[PDB]
């Protein structure tokens, strides 16, 4: 049943058990995201959707916090701005300087949300340098450059839930995590290209384009 | 120089007192000519007065002849196209007072067929600017000797 | 570079973001000005407490009272102190950065006395 709440002072109504981000969308408040797509399951790995809720001490994940009656939510106060800048610092630590050769340039969420919710300049100058990773060969239709992955797990969720191609998975652990088929395989599904529209970064790109 | 020191500052904190003054002045003008002034805006040491095409000559007479507002110089005339509006055009007069060292604006509205009164009766320099606005946007400035 | 902007530690951008702190374009129609007249302002309130004063604002948000009506219903302390000055004189076109002129004559001047041009500081 529809409840009611407060968001940056505006009041909105949506059904129970809903995600806060859907409420914010209803109220027009623009909130960032990488891991959240409407047609896919939820996860909370990107940590960019953080907002302040008076009930809880830390900022919480709009993508996953259930909506409750009478809860008040700010998305403008300094804590949120700092937390977003910090997350984007972290996201762009180990991201290669490939924007000119990335086919997503001009249509990448990482650019836009770093320009809008992020720092003018980075403090990562380390001499040991950025992480690297190898490119996978998952077939003609999808080109890979997996130094650009942010590990959003949109690809996995799509493949295993909407398509039925469970060959795509999350190998490894930690910073050496690697989305891929653990051995050389091909992404056998007739829905394979929708993955390209799902990845925010150009780690999976159309090949004949 | 070892370290350069440039303090961080907003450029708009410089304007707050002038802005309060402009608000008071606009309030005086709205109280003084309630028949004409629909509204007024303020933004960073710039004032704007919103009026209707009938109110152009009267308000200009007030702004040219009144003592506190000797806006004698005509800086510019400009039209702007907002097709989303019923009255798509929005004619804009800018004014200046060398006496008090101040500028002020004055906005009206028009259409492709609804004309605007010409202030060549007062400011002769408006002749060419109104000919421009006609040629550029199509606005018709009634009373103009040679448009 | 300059120091507080090249500082690597306590230099958040959201404090030196002067673009998203831009000052709003205020708009005041006759409705919003008569409320400031019949009522007052946050600095000089003249408003009733509670939902009574709320609907008092609401009466003006709509065409309930007019600008000339509340111009005639305004006591001397209202006008002479919120429309005009306390002295009763109207305000003048404000200057942001005033300039008091001064004349230089004789030897400092760019041209001598005979010429029809002068020199202002």
């Amino acid at each position: 049943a529809e409840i009611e709440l407060t968001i940056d002072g505006h009041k909105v109504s949506i059904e129970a058990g809903s995600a806060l981000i859907q409420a914010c969308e209803k109220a027009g408040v623009t909130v960032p995201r990488y891991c959240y797509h409407d047609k896919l399951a939820i996860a909370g790995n990107c940590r960019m959707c953080l907002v302040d809720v008076e009930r809880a001490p830390k900022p919480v994940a709009s993508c996953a916090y259930p909506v409750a009656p009478g809860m008040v939510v700010r998305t403008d106060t300094e804590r949120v701005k700092q937390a977003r800048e910090n997350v984007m610092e972290m996201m762009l630590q180990n991201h290669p300087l490939d924007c000119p050769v990335c086919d997503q340039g001009g249509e990448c969420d990482l650019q836009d949300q770093s320009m809008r919710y992020g720092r003018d300049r980075g403090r990562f100058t380390e001499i040991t340098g950025k992480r690297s990773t190898e490119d996978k060969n998952i077939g003609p239709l999808v080109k890979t450059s997996m130094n650009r992955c942010i590990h959003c797990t949109r690809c996995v969720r799509f493949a295993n839930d909407i398509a039925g191609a469970p060959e795509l998975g999350s190998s490894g652990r930690g910073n050496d995590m690697q989305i891929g088929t653990y051995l050389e395989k091909n992404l056998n599904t007739e829905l394979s290209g929708n993955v390209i529209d799902l990845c925010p970064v150009g780690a999976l790109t159309n090949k004949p384009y | 120089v070892d370290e350069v020191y440039e303090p961080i500052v907003n450029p708009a904190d410089r304007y707050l007192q002038h802005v309060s003054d402009l608000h008071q002045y606009a309030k005086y003008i709205m109280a003084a000519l309630p028949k004409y002034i629909q509204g007024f805006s303020v933004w960073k040491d710039e004032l704007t007065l919103h009026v209707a095409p009938s109110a152009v000559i009267p308000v200009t007479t007030f702004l040219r002849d009144n003592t506190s507002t000797q806006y004698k110089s005509i800086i510019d005339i400009t039209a702007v196209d907002y097709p989303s509006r019923e009255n798509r055009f929005e004619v804009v007069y800018n004014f200046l007072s060398v006496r008090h060292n101040s500028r002020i604006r004055l906005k009206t509205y028009a259409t492709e067929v609804t004309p605007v009164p010409s202030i060549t009766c007062l400011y002769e320099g408006a002749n060419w600017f109104e000919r421009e606005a006609y040629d550029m946007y199509g606005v018709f400035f009634e009373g103009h000797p040679d448009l | 570079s300059s120091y507080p902007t090249n500082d690597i530690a306590e230099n958040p951008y959201w404090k030196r973001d002067h673009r998203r702190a831009y000052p709003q374009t205020a708009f005041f129609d006759q409705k919003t000005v008569t409320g400031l007249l019949e009522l007052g302002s946050e600095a000089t309130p003249r408003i009733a407490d509670g939902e009574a004063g709320t609907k008092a604002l609401a009466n003006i948000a709509n065409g309930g009272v007019s600008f000339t009506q509340a111009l005639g219903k305004s006591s001397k302390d209202v006008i002479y102190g919120e429309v005009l000055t306390v002295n009763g004189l109207p305000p003048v076109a404000p200057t942001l950065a005033p300039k008091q002129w001064k004349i230089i004559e004789g030897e400092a001047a760019i041209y001598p006395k005979g010429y029809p041009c002068r020199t202002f500081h």
Binding site: T30 | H23 | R20, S41, E42, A43, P45, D49, G50
Partner: peptide
């Protein structure tokens, strides 16, 4: 102009109205 940004670039500004021109808030009670 088709490369125009899909994200809102500059959020709402900051009020600089003087308090003498702000519509009064009635006291809560």
């Amino acid at each position: 102009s088709a490369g125009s940004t899909a994200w809102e670039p500059v959020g709402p500004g900051r009020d600089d109205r003087p308090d003498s021109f702000k519509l009064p808030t009635p006291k809560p009670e």
